[PDB]
Ligand binder design. Structure first.
Ligand SMILES: [Hg+2]
Ligand SMILES: [Hg+2]
Ligand SMILES: [Mg+2]
Length: 307
């Protein structure tokens, strides 16, 4: 079976999240969604750094064409952070847009560029809760002239995103729905339609909640299962097909990104935050970062945001 390695050099995260693999610099970036910190890992040189801000963060993606600059979330603002990748604070911050200026208790959560470089991201209540809590989020993309467009409402916990290789489908996760949805994606108008369930956890006895996801070159989705102690591999060719399960030692698996020189090493983030209604005792909940090899598939390099 696949090899699952705990990355000792990286330590433990409260809620490690938002992994992004920059293929040209062979570097993994990620966030902690509770501790207000950004993180950088260079595996070939065993180099780790972090950056502190005073707002809640949920994604970090290199800005296309601008070395040393990243598109990030700061609470409800999408911003450009100028960061040298090693100092413990940003050099400067350039706000782009506040997606929800008048919803004081919301935050941005998962975000990712589509294959064309358009940032997609969604919101949630800061005090969202599972299985039931306030449902206040929406799904957006950042379009022309730095204005966002809304694509879906009634989202409890805005989470993982992926697009098919032929640009005809988008896949999206609201963790509260305990399923992965598929949509027809119109690359020319950047709109989505015909929402329907692709994979429903209760139909396959999968515990926990879908969180982050990524897609491989064959079109399979790799889905992080929060409170499931696993990643799952699901089909996009047929609905409701579980292809494989890989157990991860940490119960609170949060997200996934393919990396390594050949894009065939799956980086997996997790959360050490101990929750009062957990299916797992506190001794099990650590928050390590893992690397999975031997899956027999390749992914894609992380896409930079175009502004
Ligand atoms: Hg930073
Ligand atoms: Hg940053
Ligand atoms: Mg997430």
């Amino acid at each position: 079976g696949p090899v699952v390695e705990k990355i000792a050099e990286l330590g433990k995260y409260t809620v490690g999240e938002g992994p992004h693999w920059d293929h040209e610099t062979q570097t993994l970036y990620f966030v902690d969604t509770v501790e207000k910190t950004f993180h950088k890992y260079v595996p070939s040189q065993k180099k780790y750094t972090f950056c502190k801000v005073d707002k809640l963060v949920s994604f970090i993606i290199p800005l296309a064409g601008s070395p040393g600059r990243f598109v990030v979330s700061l609470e409800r603002e999408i911003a450009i952070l100028t960061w040298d990748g090693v100092s413990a604070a940003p050099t400067s911050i350039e706000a782009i847009v506040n997606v929800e200026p008048h919803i004081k208790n919301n935050r941005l959560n998962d975000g990712k560029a589509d294959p064309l470089g358009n940032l997609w991201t969604g919101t949630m209540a800061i005090d969202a809760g599972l299985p039931i809590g306030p449902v206040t989020g929406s799904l957006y993309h950042l379009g022309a002239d730095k204005k966002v467009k809304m694509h879906e409402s009634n989202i409890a916990i805005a989470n993982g995103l992926a697009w098919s290789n032929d640009l005809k489908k988008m896949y999206y996760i609201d963790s509260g729905k305990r399923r992965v949805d598929e949509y027809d994606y119109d690359a020319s108008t950047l709109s989505i339609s015909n929402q329907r369930p692709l994979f429903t956890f209760e139909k396959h006895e999968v515990p926990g909640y879908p969180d982050g996801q990524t897609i491989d070159e064959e079109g399979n989705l790799w889905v992080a299962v929060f409170q499931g102690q696993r990643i799952i591999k699901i089909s996009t060719q047929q609905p409701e097909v579980l292809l494989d399960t890989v157990k991860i030692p940490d119960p609170q698996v949060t997200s996934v990104a393919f990396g390594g020189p050949n894009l065939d090493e799956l980086y997996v983030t997790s959360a050490g935050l101990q929750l009062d209604d957990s299916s797992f005792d506190k001794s099990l909940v650590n928050g390590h970062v893992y690397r999975v090899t031997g899956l027999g598939v390749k992914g894609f390099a992380g896409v930079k945001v175009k502004l």
